Symmetry: D2
Subunit: 409 residues, 4 copies
């Protein structure tokens, strides 16, 4: 099968999402900052809402893969479970008094259940009667320690972050926060052992859960394979120049890209990702956050054998929207700003995901921008942000495209 993403707007055939669960069920007002999650959510409500989102896509014919599912089938293959536990349960991560007990117990479990735990973490409490456990019940009960043997990954809800399908291949994103790399591990197991991937054909442009990656960090929200051989990558607080360059390089080498346009995010407004200020709705229509987009500094990165490092780089003086338009053959892009005149209230229209040109999934709370997009010709199918939006991320953050056709530029 030919997996690959050749756009942002063209018809999405296959996507991967992940429903909230045990991760979020372990969330408290006191532990969410350290667990990297915005705020505590009504988990059963959010599970529902997600199922709604998911179903509106299946309804439209899109194949929609849920991470818990995939993880579950994956774990049933003994080799793949071992590949994970070998990496997740070590002396360094769990402690020498707990390695064995923890691992045997996890292995004693049911596939579905064991997946919940892998994504949702394990508490000393969940462990079967024993001592190594009590010692943790003890540090928790006497010092105020985290009661976590395996820290929960609520950020899995955001499938966009972890991996990036750029044309005919994927990246295994080195995540900023060490903690979050646990997510990338689980997702690699799936891409490595799951039936639907192991046998599919695709490349691996960058990333390796085995290497450390150092100062090199790359994040999903920042990556966009827009078609026409071009790729946009945001360089900010989360995706570094030392990662982007290695990706470009790996790309130009397999002849996978022609040009990579680095969207330089200014330090101020660089505490975010590209897809948080810039989004495609149609082949030539984007929603934009001005204050940041008018300040983004574009750089065209193109291969070159005249270079020992094989690439050439230039700062464009044209604006990002102009550079982006011209990269697509387009005169300019039609732009809907979002995030003072008609706005009944404040709202931020970005991060809506595309199902196909002109058809978008957005948030019900963004009624102002939503209208603006309809007037501009886009069908907006909404979903609830009461619990899902307490993550600031939108449908684009809750999706990792896997298969999606391109368009004529």
């Amino acid at each position: 099968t030919k997996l690959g993403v050749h756009s942002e707007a063209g018809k999405l055939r296959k996507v991967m999402v992940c429903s909230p669960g045990l991760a979020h069920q372990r969330l408290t007002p006191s532990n969410c900052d350290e667990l990297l999650f915005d705020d505590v959510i009504w988990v059963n409500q959010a599970k529902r809402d997600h199922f709604d989102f998911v179903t509106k896509m299946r309804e439209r014919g899109i194949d929609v893969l849920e991470m818990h599912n995939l993880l579950t089938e994956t774990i049933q293959n003994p080799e793949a479970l071992k590949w994970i536990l070998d990496r997740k349960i070590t002396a360094d991560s769990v402690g020498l008094g707990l390695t064995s007990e923890l691992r045997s117990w996890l292995e004693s479990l049911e596939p579905r259940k064991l997946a919940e735990y892998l994504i949702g973490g394990v508490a000393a409490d969940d462990l079967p009667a024993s001592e190594g456990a009590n010692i943790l019940k003890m540090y928790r009960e006497y010092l105020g320690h985290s009661s976590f043997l395996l820290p929960p990954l609520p950020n899995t809800q955001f499938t966009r972050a972890t991996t990036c399908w750029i044309y005919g291949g994927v990246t295994l994103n080195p995540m900023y926060w060490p903690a979050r790399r646990q997510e990338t591990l689980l997702t690699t197991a799936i891409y490595k052992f799951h039936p639907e991937f192991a046998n599919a054909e695709f490349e691996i442009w960058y990333g390796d859960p085995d290497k450390d990656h150092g100062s090199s960090t790359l994040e999903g929200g920042d990556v966009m394979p827009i078609g026409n051989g071009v790729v946009l990558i945001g360089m900010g607080e989360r995706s570094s120049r030392q990662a982007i360059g290695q990706v470009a390089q790996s790309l130009f080498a397999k002849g996978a890209a022609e040009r990579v346009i680095v969207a330089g995010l200014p330090k101020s407004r660089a505490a975010m990702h590209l897809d948080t200020v810039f989004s495609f709705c149609d082949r030539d229509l984007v929603t934009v956050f001005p204050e940041v987009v008018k300040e983004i500094v574009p750089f065209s990165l193109r291969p070159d054998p005249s270079s020992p490092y094989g690439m050439n780089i230039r700062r464009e003086e044209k604006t990002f929207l102009e550079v982006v338009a011209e990269s697509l053959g387009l005169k300019k892009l039609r732009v809907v700003e979002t995030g003072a005149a008609e706005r009944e209230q404040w709202d931020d229209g970005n991060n809506v995901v595309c199902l196909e040109p002109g058809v978008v999934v957005g948030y019900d709370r963004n009624t102002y921008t939503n209208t603006l997009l309809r007037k501009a010709g886009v069908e907006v199918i909404t979903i609830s942000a009461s619990e899902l939006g307490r993550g600031r991320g939108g449908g684009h953050c809750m999706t990792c495209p896997i298969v999606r056709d391109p368009i004529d530029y």
Copy 2:
């Protein structure tokens, strides 16, 4: 032979590291980025240091200054290859700069080289090139740090990165990934320096070519008191995962008989911030926290899985240290009448009853000179702005035993 056999024993060989380029680079902006509380007055700060250095040297101690070791160390091409191969990678500098940078550093005279290796390198330091310019460009138009190799201003706190527990040392896996650079440089010295290479000693824990994940251990949390006992602070910076592996390695080589884990209450510091030795039975304390340390004692046991047995002590922390040393009681000096607030913890013993402390802790000082301690004072005005002091600026290497 190299080793640290107590906290208050006679100090004969110490390692410190003066402020410098790393600090000259500090800015109110990169201030937190670089994990340093504030921007000090560098030149003034160096003087206070040399002063602190000269004082211990007067008492005859051997004082090794990191820059000197590094400088001597990188004169051994193999020693340099060892570091540059780990410090200059595509992941740390990026594809376009690893060549011109290594080229340019390899061409520097040793002292200048050690300077950068510690103080970092800015785009500006590099001879004109695309790369340098590309870097300057992102710096000019986006505001990113122009640091090819970021500075390591906390090198000045030699206590943090490696720990000499009796006959061996630990190369500590620092909480923050960034500070692991520090530990890289020291390991290099322990590997190639003459005073090290041909020295007899073991490495108890730590490896800079590994990813320890949740295993982290910080200098300020370790204390080989003596009597085959090692005190280790468990807290916001020293994980049990690391700690368990250290006690186990220790026992395994018959280097210690007990590891008393000092459980720091959830109330961001190191044991040595709230507990300092001054004399065989004298310790400065921070009551509020110190009186809330849940004490755990791990001992060797062939009847335990991991091979270790751990038990939660009931008595106060203070008691379980007294009796762990074989003393009835510990003399205690509470800090953190007397005119104004002050914290005089973190002082360093040059030998019994001899401690170097800060000038500003006028109170705590007399409370110690009252307990029969010669409190040799230095300037905290710059070296101390960084919330750190004596014990922190020192990493014992050879300190004779007590009884």
Copy 3:
């Protein structure tokens, strides 16, 4: 008639509430914090869950007063409006040159549009083009300063914060943050001028908007009259002792309270945040905090030069509250199996009936087990404010129990 609150579980008969409005429409990720308001909410939705809540009480026969209407009808009295405006629009507040413009325009608006701007703040843009306001837009655009002739008051949504009805008397609380004193004002004028209260029979226990109360701050959340002369009051970051003493002294004057227990909160919070009644002998707590509050009893002491005797309780809070009410022991339900919810801050309609939040499923179930009836509303946008049912209501007429 005779206004008054005699209990925290009695049959609620008259409550004031105030729905989200233009106030929250001005919220922006930047300004919400400099505006003392948690996070930015979806106003239209919030207006709906609010109305749903207001509706759930009116059908149980409760009479419900909403602030916007109250203001409206209130400012339809030339006097009242002058009383607010002479206060709201001054030179120190608005800017020496705008006073005229800003007042002229407001005075030319229909009541229901004026009141809205009163609670919702008036932006430079809102004013008819002038050399006056146009300067502010220059500052708002070129300097990034707030452009508010009048600042929005989104906290008016919590009518529990500005005034308390301590048995046939009310308190005009001097809020902690100075800005929020702008809310106390409008409710005062409403207690003062509106027909509902104007002719009403009730005392004025403490506070005055014309006064600057120094370090004396009091906030609705801590105050709760529980039955016979007893009155609980939190002394934490928001209700200062300077105010507590003067309130208890005052109540001791007209002799409207026998005892005033002062619950000294430990460690950003209020009493009703960790303590809430649902039935005559039932509560909900946040053990961690409740278990650690140092009680203090206040009683009239003729021998005292300042008229009181500040004794201190030796048993625990739940081991005091239960007493001053004669219960054998207080039925306690805890919050603070599924996930995490904070059941506290439930407003009581009558005994055994409580309007709560829908997200706190566990606690609601526990409460139901303890016997309570839980009518729930949505916290999606109203719960984006840390508080709930209790905080969103100012009881004005509740029945006693015994």
Copy 4:
């Protein structure tokens, strides 16, 4: 000569200061945020640097007045004292059951010890045993409150802040933070009663410790009467337009000012008063923090007899810097940028006379450049006195300084 400041860089004749004191000894790492103090300082050492600094202007023949002191000679007058206690001790400020104990106690004190407390604050312990302080040491006991019935006022060390001398007059500044109002109350007692003041000719342009003032606030750091009948009053995080309007309004009505240049200061979360990013070092010399001064959006209120309110405001085009040099009838200011051996922040120095400033030892670079510009730089230690942020300027409230074009 008559009291009044007529420029920022001309011969300084009289200056009021305040050494670090008892308020500073109450600072703990647990409470310097509620008191508005960056960090805990070595008090007796700061006392020596403050004094060092005093000595340096004193030997140059500048009558250096000190607050604790002026407050003692002032507090001498039973009236002066009634006025202060009457406002400092109230049922709102200290509450019902402490008014008398605390006030009686304060009065049984030696004038200079009483001064100590007014500025340094008073804790419960300081008071004799009682039902009062005890059922109050009790709150600090379990509840862990702020033992202070009176809180110290450590920022008193920055006299520039609470009051300003703009030409033949002064302003009793309405501080941003309430807590900081208690300061202005003391300096006011001093201007109202103390000899060197209550018998001197000057005006009270704006201000009143008894009035509310609402959204109208000002901070000494922002105001500068640079001479030529002009007053630079930066608008920002602490000084608001509401206060500036009423200030200039009076400045115009009484004829003490011809134009006021509001320095519209760019939004930024951290304080930032004009004298912390802009400093006069000479008649045509100024230090500057590029990254800010360039963002300043000048405005020029001038009186207008026909206007209702008595003025008119235009938005200057040229840079805030040309709108200033032109404001002094000057061709163009000479600026020294600050903020290359390390990172140096030279702003906030104070002139004693044209071409002679007093700055910090540590800002070796900036100084080097000022000395490159013809400025004599007398330096004082900032190890404790500068752990704050401001320096020379922020620690002085000029009472009599001469006009320039001299």
